[PDB]
Amino acid sequence: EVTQLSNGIVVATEHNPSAHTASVGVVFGSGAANENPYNNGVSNLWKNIFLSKENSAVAAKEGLALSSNISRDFQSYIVSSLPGSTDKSLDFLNQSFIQQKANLLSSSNFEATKKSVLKQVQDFEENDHPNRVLEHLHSTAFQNTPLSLPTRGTLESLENLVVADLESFANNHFLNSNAVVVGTGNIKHEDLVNSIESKNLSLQTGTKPVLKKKAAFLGSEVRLRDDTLPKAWISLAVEGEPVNSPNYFVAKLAAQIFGSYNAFEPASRLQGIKLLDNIQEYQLCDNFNHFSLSYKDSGLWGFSTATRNVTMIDDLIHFTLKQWNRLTISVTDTEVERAKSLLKLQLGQLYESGNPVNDANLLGAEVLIKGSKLSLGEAFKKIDAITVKDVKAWAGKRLWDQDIAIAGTGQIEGLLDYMRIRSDMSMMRW
């Protein structure tokens, strides 16, 4: 059961007696979308300061494990431990992250962390193609709007930061009205609330800055061509649904219909996905996957693919977009029936895995928007209630003759112009 109390800070807890671990954490409603192009990467630097050697050493001496996660809409700082020592994690979180920040922002520590983060971002930008392609897709989809800033930070901006930027961001965003205290695993809600009440655990006053511009989607493309690479990596997307939309689960199911494909695994060549019937003959791709990502203001629905067949890219894109076209007009009931159970198993593993850190992140990110956490059972009935008419109604609105965003790198010379791709979003025979 999920129990949430608004006394003090918003305290959420999900109790699981079977687990042998307990996680206690703080989730902030600010993310990479709350920063600007001149201090971009301040959140990643804060994360790596919390994860620095001295802080991690003092934590691990007591027997605790530290996790930090940076995203568009939230920042997560989690302390995981054994069930008997769940009170010690609160003490470490109070003493280190909240009460005092002078020790963590010393000159030498800041310089070392800055040099390590610069090295990491430099390695990412050159030797991680499928993920940086998705980052550029975000950066070109939401350009000149908060949601397009990369979460790690750019190489040029990360140099200009000083400790003053970090402390300014901490003053502006680490607030009581922006925070949720989350408890996961083998702990009780009453015990957690009592433990918080015994201490003060006050973060700050409130009134975080309000953004003047809301995120917007622009049809656009960016091409980063490099002929010294062996493949071509391509990510393509349209505007999707945000969190708290009525069509959220319909979006995830429509994504699940096409699924993912790996050419080298024997089993995934026999899937009921009809798209493979066009792909398999000439080995058009090595792998693809479909995504329905949702944020607070907007979302992305699309796919990502990698291939060595540098002379047949347009055929791959054409067949994929013709499979997308089929959703509006001629989706069949068996497709939806398979999609329901595939999605239920897909959602089942996500929310019911052994690791409590994923549960903590999900619960903290959920209560910061909805105000409450949807149960597993009520999720299934909405999934089971989906019909063919709903899928057709959603697809006729979100992907029929709509603008797209594209991002590719590698031997993308075979990738045709924008308009030729944009015309594939309709059939013209219907």
Partner 1 sequence: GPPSGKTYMGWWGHMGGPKQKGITSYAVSPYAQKPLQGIFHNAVFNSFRRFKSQFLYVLIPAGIYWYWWKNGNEYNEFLYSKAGREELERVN
Q: Interface with ligand CDL by CB under 6 A: which residues?
A: 318, 427-429
What does the block give as tokens for 395?
Answer: 């697809």
Pick out residues in 151-210 that bind partner 1 (CB under 8 A): none
Shorter beta-carbon distance to partner 1: residue 227 or 281: 227
Shorter beta-carbon distance to partner 1: residue 87 or 314: 314
Rg (CA), the chain: 23
Report CA 197 to chain centroid distance, whole Å: 32
Place of tokens 């060549």: 269
Q: Cα–Cα distances in Å, from 164 out to 39, 52, 167, 381?
A: 11, 19, 5, 50
Task: Determine whether 336 is exposed, middle or buried from the number of CB atoms within 10 Å of its CB (0-12, 13-18, 19+).
Answer: middle
Shorter beta-carbon distance to ligand CDL: residue 165 or 315: 315
Residue nearest to ligand CDL according to CB distances in the complex? 429
Q: Which does 428 bind (CB under 5 to 8 A by kind): ligand CDL, partner 1, none?
A: ligand CDL
Question: Least distance in Å: CB of 223 to partner 1?
Answer: 4
**315 contacts partner 1 (rule: CB under 8 A):** no
Q: How many residues bind partner 1 (CB under 8 A)?
A: 25
Calpha distance 139→150 (Å, rounded): 7
Shorter beta-carbon distance to partner 1: residue 39 or 140: 140
**227 contacts partner 1 (rule: CB under 8 A):** yes
Question: Least distance in Å: CB of 32 to partner 1?
Answer: 21
Place of tokens 């009453």: 190
What residues have CB less than 8 Å from 220, skipping those under 6 apart? 140, 141, 143, 405
**Cβ pair 169, 66 in contact under 8 A:** no
Shorter beta-carbon distance to partner 1: residue 188 or 422: 422
Helix (H) or strand (E) holding 159: helix 155-160
The pattern of x and - marking residues 137 through 156 that bind partner 1 according to CB under 8 A reads: ---x----------------
**416 contacts partner 1 (rule: CB under 8 A):** yes
**In the complex, which residues of this chain contact partner 1 (CB under 8 A)?**
140, 218-228, 310-311, 313-314, 403-404, 411, 413-414, 416, 418-419, 422
